[PDB]
Amino acid sequence: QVWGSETVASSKVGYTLPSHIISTSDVTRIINSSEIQSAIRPAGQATQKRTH
RNA sequence: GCCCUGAAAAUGGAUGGCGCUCAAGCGUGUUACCUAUACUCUACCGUCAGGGUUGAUAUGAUGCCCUGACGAGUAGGCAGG
Numbered sequence: 001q002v003w004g005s006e007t008v009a010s011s012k013v014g015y016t017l018p019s020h021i022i023s024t025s026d027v028t029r030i031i032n033s034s035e036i037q038s039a040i041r042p043a044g045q046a047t048q049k050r051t052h
Numbered sequence: 053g054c055c056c057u058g059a060a061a062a063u064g065g066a067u068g069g070c071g072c073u074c075a076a077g078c079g080u081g082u083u084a085c086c087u088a089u090a091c092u093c094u095a096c097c098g099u100c101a102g103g104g105u106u107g108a109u110a111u112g113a114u115g116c117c118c119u120g121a122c123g124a125g126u127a128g129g130c131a132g133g
């Protein structure tokens with residue numbers, strides 16, 4: 001009642017809860033999604049060999 | 053050309069000094085040699101630039117790592133402590 005919900009308006013006059021700018025906070029799961037993984041090229045070594 | 057005369061100033065006095073006369077002087081030529089915080093190569097510190105790497109089960113993605121170049125400073129500006 002005090003802060004409102006998706007189906008209940010907050011008792012505060014004209015107030016609504018802040019909106020998220022990102023759907024989820026786990027970016028690793030987003031990267032591991034099939035859509036992203038099927039569009040990227042294979043990675044490297046994480047520590048480049050010294051050639052000279 | 054060199055040397056000499058012309059050429060007289062006040063404390064004692066300065067090719068830097070000693071000293072030097074086929075010079076250790078003057079003109080010229082040929083080599084060797086000495087040494088700057090400059091140049092070449094290497095290491096380390098920092099700065100800037102271009103790149104690699106989120107995959108869980110081990111910790112900093114402002115993380116870790118690869119490559120190249122650069123570094124004087126009053127007045128003054130900015131940044132990290």
Ligand SMILES: [Mg+2]
Nearest residue numbers: 077078079080
């Ligand atoms: Mg001579």
Ligand SMILES: [Mg+2]
Nearest residue numbers: 088089090091
């Ligand atoms: Mg030097």
Ligand SMILES: [Mg+2]
Nearest residue numbers: 099123124125
């Ligand atoms: Mg400086």
